[PDB]
Structure 1
């Protein structure tokens, strides 16, 4: 079913976004 695939991909995108933000924050805090 094409629909389920579409939705899976859609959500995946967001999860990637949040992971990128978190690792950016970590990279900034370890210097201190």
Structure 2
């Protein structure tokens, strides 16, 4: 429960970080 919630939130945060990095890189490439 609580531990599963904590680790799922950690995984979601990491996935959001990777998504943000991807979006930033693609924005730079689209500007080019």
More helix by share: 2
Whose radius of gyration is greater, 1 or 2? Answer: 1
TM-score by length of 2: 0.82
Matches within 5 A, 1:1-32: 1-32=1-32
Aligned length in residues = 32
Which portions of structure 1, spanning 4 or more consecutive aligned residues, are displaced by more than 2 angstroms? none
RMSD over aligned Cα, in angstroms?
0.8
Structure 1 unaligned residues grouped into runs of 5+: none
Task: Report the Cα offset of residue 22 of structure 1.
Answer: 0.4
TM-score by length of 1: 0.82
